[PDB]
Amino acid sequence: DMIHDAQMDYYGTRLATCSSDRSVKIFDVRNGGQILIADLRGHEGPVWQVAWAHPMYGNILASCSYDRKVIIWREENGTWEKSHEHAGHDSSVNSVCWAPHDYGLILACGSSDGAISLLTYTGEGQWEVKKINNAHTIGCNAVSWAPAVVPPSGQKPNYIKRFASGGCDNLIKLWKEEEDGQWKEEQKLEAHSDWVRDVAWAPSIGLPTSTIASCSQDGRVFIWTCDDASSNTWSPKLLHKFNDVVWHVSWSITANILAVSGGDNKVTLWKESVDGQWVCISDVN
Amino acid sequence: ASMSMFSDFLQSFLKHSSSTVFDLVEEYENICGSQVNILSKIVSRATPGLQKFSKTASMLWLLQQEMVTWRLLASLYRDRIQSALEEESVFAVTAVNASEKTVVEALFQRDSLVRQSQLVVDWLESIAKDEIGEFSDNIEFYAKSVYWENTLHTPLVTELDPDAPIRQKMPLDDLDREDEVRLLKYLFTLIRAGMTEEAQRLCKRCGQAWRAATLEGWKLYHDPNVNGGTELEPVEGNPYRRIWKISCWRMAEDELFNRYERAIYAALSGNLKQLLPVCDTWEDTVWAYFRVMVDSLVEQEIQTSVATLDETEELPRLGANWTLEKVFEELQATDLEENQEHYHIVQKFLILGDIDGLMDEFSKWLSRNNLPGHLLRFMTHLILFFRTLGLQTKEEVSIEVLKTYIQLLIREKHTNLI
Amino acid sequence: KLYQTPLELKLKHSTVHVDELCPLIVPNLGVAVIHDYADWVKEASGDLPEAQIVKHWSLTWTLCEALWGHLKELDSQLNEPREYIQILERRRAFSRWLSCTATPQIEEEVSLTQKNSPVEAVFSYLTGKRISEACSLAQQSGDHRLALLLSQFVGSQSVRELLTMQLVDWHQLQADSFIQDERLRIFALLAGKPVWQLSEKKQINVCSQLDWKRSLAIHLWYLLPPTASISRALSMYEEAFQNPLRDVCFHLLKLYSDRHYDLNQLLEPRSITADPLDYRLSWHLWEVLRALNYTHLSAQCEGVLQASYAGQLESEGLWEWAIFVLLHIDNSGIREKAVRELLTRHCQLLETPESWAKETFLTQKLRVPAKWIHEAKAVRAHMESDKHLEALCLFKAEHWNRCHKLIIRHLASDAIINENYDYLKGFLEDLAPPERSSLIQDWETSGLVYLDYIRVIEMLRHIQQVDCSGNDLEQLHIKVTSLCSRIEQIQCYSAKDRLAQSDMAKRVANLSTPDPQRVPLRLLAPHIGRLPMPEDYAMDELR
């Protein structure tokens, strides 16, 4: 009937769709032609978000549902069997995304009972679930990692370690890591008035000014950007203010055009001008 | 200010015999270091932007590169000459219950490649230490009393240890994040300079007990009752070295959080970086490559000697180790400028072992070596030191170097000690 | 911009150098992009840039080539320290372009003025750089002094002060001297300043009928061209009267006159207030001015323009143009990331063959990394196409670098059809060359098992009586057991790899002894079922 989130695969290949009928359909797009391949079904609740993995670790695609469980099925030799299954959450899952392509196979999924998840695959498939509780006041609703931030020998290059999450209590920013057991998040930023819907970080195209967009239920779209690297500055900029609530908010990779999806069942493309103010490009549909 | 060095080097040469040739190179290092200190005081007193000091700054750099090249030469050629005398005498029986420490001590005695590669690391760590100077105590932080003081002031962290970002939520204090990033950068700089104990003490004073415990776990297990060679007081080390290496590799692979902390973890483990290597130096890159090669060789030896268990290899590691030609090609692709630099080329040739060929090429090219006035003297001094140490220099090359030195002395009007 | 001939012509006019696995254009003498220099004028006709929006683009390209273009002389002179012939040639070209641009608006005004006053015809014809045409019209109309006065419009002295003296004498002395309105402008234009050094007969009231182009031409082709340069004259003619704030012609003449010493401070203020310039035109103007030593340009602005051009070229579908625009950056870390993104977004259509039509390997003609493009194409084919055909393009591209496990996992999906073992044998034979080239000799079990399974199956199909272990049989069995242990007890959830290992182990089950040969036991099949349930159906009787 009504779909929730439908993200593409790699280089415009398949299109894993998710609706409210507990059906994770993986449709193929060949020269603009939509064609279904398989229908992964095995959840008691409605499917929410879905994110595909990188092509270096085969062909994995994780999808969240409302049955307090996370399914991660593979795709090889026409067999879309469910590989790993993580059910460490207490309530339903809202958002579920993966890390970078160079981070192996790390996926972060947020729950609704004030907790999250972080499945890190090892050398075989033993996902070490290291989660807890006490997150936001109502739970999580947004989960998206930031850009692949880089760190002189001749082996595996370093990056920035793993540390990313997101709540719904009018607080959505990045996080910091360390050199101990896991990571110690440190990035407090509050500028919203109601429940935060979606919050996707913008991918950096080589520049150090990393930005992060967010959308709440009040109708405002904040764009929090940093001044420099390793600086204590998280000033947010209001892009637009609508009368209705916003759903999701995606960003492009070339010009980093913000795709504001929400309001009156219409998507709008926002792009930063030379003066610094965000203006609407055109209207979708 | 540098013109006295031409006489001081001759006086130092004449004071030393062939049996004290390494005390001569240590006196050459000290003459250069005394002059570098004078020139550094001159350059630091100069008002920024006067073109008059560009030559003095180029001279400071030239003599600093000379000083560290003498230090490298003394370290490598002392080892090579000692090794060539000891190859007649050692059958060592490996004990069936040797600790990791005892195995590695036996490797460093037996293997000249591992030992000379570590001397290159120690040399490059000494340069980075000289550059840090006394400035370790003047680091002003915004936090005065507690880790992430500003984030704590702003309550949001559920776990007080270090697992909240992987558990849930992501909000604390930007000031605490900046303080942690600065501490990680300082720890990485200390590890690159060569002060592991100082970095551990600084981490313990700041409050990073877990970070200090993770950094101290780089040494292997060495029991004093089992290993009879290096019998000490108590047993030090850990058996989860492979697990710690796999965890550090996974942390370095993960991105979008703490670039400084990930770089410090990769440097402590034995991997590489990406954005940190663009602003690094050629000597630091060569030292990191040598350390990575030594770590790969040690891992291969431990795997071949049936020292590590099968379950310890959790993640896949790069088993292929680089060689001298590979390291040279990497340094070239990194900084062809430093590779073509005369002092760095002589240092690389002395570290590799092909000093005679380089000297012959430099002598044949002189018949654009006439531009650098100090390179012709440095090559002659190196040839004289090699001839005093062993009988491997070319007679024609030595005669050409002597003729060039005599011509330079006659041109500079200082033939009173030729 | 959608043609490959322009990209091939623009790629041959640059000298790319491979530095730290990143191409960078440091020496370029031209480019054939959109709104570039003199090479972009040939790609603007009736079948290339449409027809209704081509004349303006051609005029904007000609203005940029005549203003920001470096003129070169044929025969050299004695004094080569200065530039007197090129500065005159550029001024003559600019005047000829201005006259040709103003003739469409001057041809209609000359018809209406001929039926009113005949003295205005000479003034209207003198604005189009017509000295003889104005002199003939002044001589063939009763006047005689005007034709002799208009012939001395060279821009020198002598007459410059004489015109001012005559104007000062006519302004007073003999009452007011009510002369004609057309003759006063012609007399004041010969003094070197028509709207500056003339308080009585000022030419500032001609902005209502004439446009700014004619006013700029009358000041640049009739003043002191020897006392000052062309840029100073253009700045003086622009600072007196403001032009349009939303036009490319009004901005090109202002960004090249007084912006010779502050181009970065002038280009940033015009783009933040009006969007008259295009996304690629600004990048082309910044790249042409920095590669010809024309003016000072910043690095951040040039990098931003290059990134915008690469994004605009990639948003339409052009991969080669986007890669060429991204390679001309400043920072190496950003350029490498842009190249890796452009190779990952599109790679199968930027090769010499296999559903592609480039200009003879466009990924390697610009001194770029050829191993990254092949890896990106293989990663895209492994996610879009099948895994049985994507493994053959990765190991044979000489860019695996310790990628034997991925190739073995991708080539194991085609374990069906036992009659077509030729592809499996070829893959097993090619996997050894990549492992030997990548210096891999410690971990080589999956490929060995895959190579031994096909040979064992062939020997069993060709000989059914020979059932003896021949050295390699024990090694193949050990490899099959080590491969099946990962699915048995190692917490590895891989159904395809487990099925491939089981098939490789069972291919020689009906030949030797095969003591094992059994699927999942009751420990993990009685609680689930469906999958993993075979290799134990041969137990009908009691042994």
**Residue B355: which of B364, B365, B345 has the closest Cα?**
B345
Query: Using the beta-carbon criterion (under 8 Å), do C333 and B320 form an inter-chain contact?
Result: no
What are the phi and psi torsion angles at A34 (to 5°)? -80, 130
Choose among A103, A147, A152: nearest Cβ to B285. Answer: A152
Contacts of B109 (CB under 8 A, 6+ apart): B90, B92, B115
Contacts of C250 (CB under 8 A, 6+ apart): C212, C243, C244
Place of tokens 């003047």: B138
User: What SS3 state is found at B273?
Assistant: coil
Return the ∠ at Cα B354 (arms to B348 and B360), rounded to 5°: 110
Contacts 24+ apart (CB under 8 A), A220-227: A220/A192, A220/A193, A221/A246, A221/A249, A221/A258, A221/A260, A221/A270, A222/A191, A222/A192, A223/A258, A223/A278, A224/A173, A224/A189, A224/A191
Which residues are bridge partners to C12 per DSSP? Answer: none
Distance CA B103, CA B229 (A): 10
Give the number of other CB atoms < 10 A from CB of residue C391. Answer: 26
User: Residue C28: enclosing H or E segment and its boundaries?
Assistant: strand C23-28
Query: Using the beta-carbon criterion (under 8 Å), do B333 and C20 form an inter-chain contact?
Result: yes
Place of tokens 């307090």: A68
Does the beta carbon of B279 lie under 8 angstroms from any beta carbon of chain C?
Answer: no
Sign for the CA dihedral angle at C18, C23, C27, C32 comes to positive
Chain B positions in Cβ-Cβ contact with residue C440 (cut-off 8 Å): 320
Distance CA C521, CA A108 (A): 34
Neighbours of chain C (3+ CB pairs under 8 A): A, B
Question: Quick check: C331 and C302 in contact, CB under 8 A?
Answer: no
Distance CA A185, CA B155 (A): 13
Contacts of C328 (CB under 8 A, 6+ apart): C24, C25, C28, C287, C306
Does the beta carbon of A274 lie under 8 angstroms from any beta carbon of chain C?
Answer: yes
User: What SS3 state is found at C172?
Assistant: coil
Contacts of C432 (CB under 8 A, 6+ apart): C447, C451
What are the phi and psi torsion angles at A260 (to 5°)? -80, 110
Q: What is the DSSP string of B204-255?
A: HHHT-HHHHHHHHTTSPPB-TTT-SSS--SS-B--S-HHHHHHHHHHHHH--
Chain C positions in Cβ-Cβ contact with residue A150 (cut-off 8 Å): 333
Distance CA C13, CA C7 (A): 10
Give the number of other CB atoms < 10 A from CB of residue C514. Answer: 16
The overall longest dimension of chain C from CA atoms, in Å, is: 144
Distance CA A84, CA A72 (A): 5
What are the phi and psi torsion angles at C438 (to 5°)? -85, 5
The overall longest dimension of chain B from CA atoms, in Å, is: 79
The pair of structure tokens assigned to A226 is 């940093």
The pair of structure tokens assigned to A37 is 């391949």
Chain B positions in Cβ-Cβ contact with residue A146 (cut-off 8 Å): 256-257
User: What SS3 state is found at B286?
Assistant: helix
Distance CA C323, CA B102 (A): 55
What are the phi and psi torsion angles at B403 (to 5°)? -65, -40
Chain B positions in Cβ-Cβ contact with residue A183 (cut-off 8 Å): 162-166, 257-258
Place of tokens 């962290």: B157
Question: Quick check: B179 and A232 in contact, CB under 8 A?
Answer: no
Burial class (CB in 10 A: 0-12, 13-18, 19+), C230: middle
Place of tokens 């290339």: C48
- Amino acid identity of residue C363, one-letter, is T
Tally of helices (H runs) and strands (E runs) in chain C: 26, 2
Place of tokens 């370790």: B136
Does the beta carbon of A150 lie under 8 angstroms from any beta carbon of chain C?
Answer: yes
**Residue A216: which of A192, A240, A250, A234 has the closest Cα?**
A192
**Radius of gyration of chain B from its Cα atoms, rounded to whole angstroms:** 25
The single-letter DSSP state of residue B297 is H
Distance CA C30, CA C34 (A): 12
Which chain B residues in 218-277 lie under 8 Å from chain A, judged by CB atoms? 246, 249-266, 268, 270-277
Place of tokens 């002199």: C135
Distance CA C32, CA C397 (A): 32
Which residues are bridge partners to A14 per DSSP? Answer: A28
Tally of helices (H runs) and strands (E runs) in chain B: 19, 0
Contacts 24+ apart (CB under 8 A), B83-89: B83/B112, B83/B115
Place of tokens 């204590």: A232
Contacts 24+ apart (CB under 8 A), C300-309: C300/C330, C301/C264, C301/C267, C301/C268, C302/C330, C303/C329, C303/C330, C303/C331, C303/C334, C307/A205, C307/A206, C307/C334, C307/C338, C308/A255, C308/C279, C308/C283, C309/C33, C309/C279, C309/C280, C309/C283
User: What SS3 state is found at B146?
Assistant: coil
Query: Using the beta-carbon criterion (under 8 Å), do C402 and B318 form an inter-chain contact?
Result: yes
Place of tokens 């350059």: B43
Q: What is the DSSP string of B128-143?
A: HHHHHTTGGG----S-
Chain C positions in Cβ-Cβ contact with residue B278 (cut-off 8 Å): 332-333
How many Å lie between the alpha carbon of A11 and the closest alpha carbon of chain C? Answer: 6
User: What SS3 state is found at B323?
Assistant: coil
Chain A positions in Cβ-Cβ contact with residue B154 (cut-off 8 Å): 188
- The nearest alpha carbon in chain B to A111 belongs to B168
Question: Quick check: C496 and C412 in contact, CB under 8 A?
Answer: yes
How many Å lie between the alpha carbon of B158 and the closest alpha carbon of chain A? Answer: 6
Question: Quick check: B380 and B414 in contact, CB under 8 A?
Answer: no
Neighbours of chain B (3+ CB pairs under 8 A): A, C
User: What SS3 state is found at C15?
Assistant: strand
The pair of structure tokens assigned to B98 is 């040797």
Mutate to test the interface with A, among B177, B202, B242 (most CBs of A within 10 A): B177
User: What SS3 state is found at C25?
Assistant: strand
Question: Quick check: B219 and B200 in contact, CB under 8 A?
Answer: no
Question: Quick check: C68 and C289 in contact, CB under 8 A?
Answer: yes
Give the number of other CB atoms < 10 A from CB of residue C203. Answer: 19
**Radius of gyration of chain A from its Cα atoms, rounded to whole angstroms:** 19
Sign for the CA dihedral angle at C478, C484, C489, C490 comes to positive
Mutate to test the interface with A, among C283, C340, C493 (most CBs of A within 10 A): C493
Distances (CA, A) of B126 to A7, B189, C405: 53, 13, 42
**Residue A197: which of A176, A177, A178, A218 has the closest Cα?**
A218
How many Å lie between the alpha carbon of C375 and the closest alpha carbon of chain A? Answer: 10
The pair of structure tokens assigned to B190 is 């200390």
Does the beta carbon of C47 lie under 8 angstroms from any beta carbon of chain B?
Answer: no
User: What SS3 state is found at C14?
Assistant: strand
Q: With DSSP H G I counted as helix, E B as strand and the rest as coil, what are the percentages for chain B, rounded to 5?
A: 65, 0, 35
What are the phi and psi torsion angles at A212 (to 5°)? -150, 120
The pair of structure tokens assigned to C183 is 């003759």
Chain C positions in Cβ-Cβ contact with residue B318 (cut-off 8 Å): 402
**Radius of gyration of chain C from its Cα atoms, rounded to whole angstroms:** 39
Question: Quick check: C35 and C65 in contact, CB under 8 A?
Answer: no
- The nearest alpha carbon in chain C to B314 belongs to C490
**Exposure string over C363-382, b if 16+ CB within 10 A, otherwise e:** bebbbbbeebbbbbbbbbbb
Length of chain B (residues): 418
Q: Which residues precede gaps in chain A, with C-N > 2.5 A?
A: 151
Does the beta carbon of C402 lie under 8 angstroms from any beta carbon of chain B?
Answer: yes
Burial class (CB in 10 A: 0-12, 13-18, 19+), C143: middle
Place of tokens 């950096």: A204
End-to-end CA distance of chain B: 22
Distance CA C431, CA C395 (A): 7
Chain C positions in Cβ-Cβ contact with residue B319 (cut-off 8 Å): 442-443
Question: Could you tell me the residue ranges of all domains in chain A?
Answer: 1-282
What are the phi and psi torsion angles at C444 (to 5°)? -155, 75
The pair of structure tokens assigned to C353 is 């063959």
User: What SS3 state is found at C191?
Assistant: coil
What was the elucidation method?
A: cryo-EM
CA dihedral C425, C426, C427, C433 (to 10 degrees): 120
Does the beta carbon of C333 lie under 8 angstroms from any beta carbon of chain B?
Answer: yes
Query: Using the beta-carbon criterion (under 8 Å), do C439 and B275 form an inter-chain contact?
Result: no
Which chain B residues in 331-350 lie under 8 Å from chain C, judged by CB atoms? 333-334
What are the phi and psi torsion angles at A76 (to 5°)? -155, 135
Mutate to test the interface with C, among A60, A77, A83, A274 (most CBs of C within 10 A): A77
Give the number of other CB atoms < 10 A from CB of residue C228. Answer: 13
Distance CA C289, CA A35 (A): 51
List helix spans (H) across C130-202: 131-139, 145-150, 159-171, 181-189
Which chain A residues in 86-125 lie under 8 Å from chain C, judged by CB atoms? 124-125
Note the Cα B392 to chain centre separation in Å: 28
Q: What is the 3-state secondary structure (H, E, C) of chain A?
A: CCECCCEECCCCCEEEEEECCCCEEEEEEECCEEEEEEEECCCCCCCCCEEECCCCCCCEEEEECCCCCEEEEECECCECCEEEEECCCCCCCCCEEECCCCCCCEEEEECCCCCEEEEECCCCCCCEECCCCCCCCCCCCCCCCCCCCCCCCCCCECCCCCCCCCCCCCCCCCCCCCCCCCCCCCCCCCCCCCCEEECCECCCCCCCCCEEEEEECCCEEEEEECCCCCCCCCEEEEEEECCCCEEEEEECCCCCCEEEEECCCCEEEEEECCCCCEEEEEECC
Chain A positions in Cβ-Cβ contact with residue B274 (cut-off 8 Å): 150-151, 157-159
Q: What is the 3-state secondary structure (H, E, C) of C296-311?
A: CCCHHHHHHHHHHHHH
What are the phi and psi torsion angles at B89 (to 5°)? -125, -5
Distance CA B40, CA A2 (A): 73
List helix spans (H) across C391-522: 392-395, 404-411, 422-437, 446-462, 472-488, 495-506
The overall longest dimension of chain A from CA atoms, in Å, is: 55
Distance CA C496, CA A182 (A): 32
Chain B positions in Cβ-Cβ contact with residue C439 (cut-off 8 Å): 320
Q: With DSSP H G I counted as helix, E B as strand and the rest as coil, what are the percentages for chain C, rounded to 5?
A: 50, 0, 45
Question: Quick check: A146 and A201 in contact, CB under 8 A?
Answer: yes
**Residue A187: which of B265, B167, B257 has the closest Cα?**
B257
